[PDB]
C-alpha cells in the first residue's frame, strides 16, 4: 500500500493532530483540490458542512483495493498517512463531481 489509515472511522474536527495538513470540505468542494505533501505526511480532511462527504480512491491508487473512506458528518475529520511518492486522485462517493488529488513527493 501507499498509505496507512490512523483511524478507520471519522473523528471530531477538534481532535485533528499537530502537524496535520488540513483540507477543508466547504461549499460542496475540496477547498484545496490539489495538495502537495511529502512521504510520511498525514493529510486530514474536515467536513465543514451539513451534507456528508468522504474521500474515495479507486482500486490501484492507494493500494490494490479501492479506499472508500467513511462518511464524515458536519465537523468531522478523517486522515490518511501517505507512505510512498505518487499522484493520488480521489472523489466524494455521494458526489462524484467533487474531485481532488494529493501529490506526494
Ligand atoms: Cu461530497
UniProtKB/Swiss-Prot annotation:
The keyword Coiled coil does not apply. Binds 1 copper ion per subunit. Cu cation binds at residues 53, 92, 95, 98. The keyword Metal-binding applies. One of its GO terms (molecular function) is copper ion binding. It comes from the Bacteria. Disulfide bonds: none annotated. GO terms for cellular component: periplasmic space. Its cofactor is Cu cation. Keywords: Copper, Electron transport, Metal-binding, Periplasm, Signal, Transport. Pathway: One-carbon metabolism; methylamine degradation. It is found in: Periplasm. Residues 1-105 form the Plastocyanin-like domain. Its main location: periplasm. Primary acceptor of electrons from methylamine dehydrogenase. Passes those electrons on either a soluble cytochrome c or to pseudoazurin. This is Amicyanin. The gene is mauC.
Amino acid at each position: 500500500d501507499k498509505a496507512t489509515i490512523p483511524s478507520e472511522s471519522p473523528f471530531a474536527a477538534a481532535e485533528v493532530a499537530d502537524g496535520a495538513i488540513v483540507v477543508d470540505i466547504a461549499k460542496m468542494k475540496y477547498e484545496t483540490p490539489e495538495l502537495h505533501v511529502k512521504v510520511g505526511d498525514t493529510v486530514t480532511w474536515i467536513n465543514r458542512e451539513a451534507m456528508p462527504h468522504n474521500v474515495h480512491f479507486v482500486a490501484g491508487v492507494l493500494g490494490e483495493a479501492a479506499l472508500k473512506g467513511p462518511m464524515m458528518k458536519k465537523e468531522q475529520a478523517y486522515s490518511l498517512t501517505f507512505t510512498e511518492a505518487g499522484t493520488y486522485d480521489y472523489h466524494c462517493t455521494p458526489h462524484p463531481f467533487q474531485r481532488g488529488k494529493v501529490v506526494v513527493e
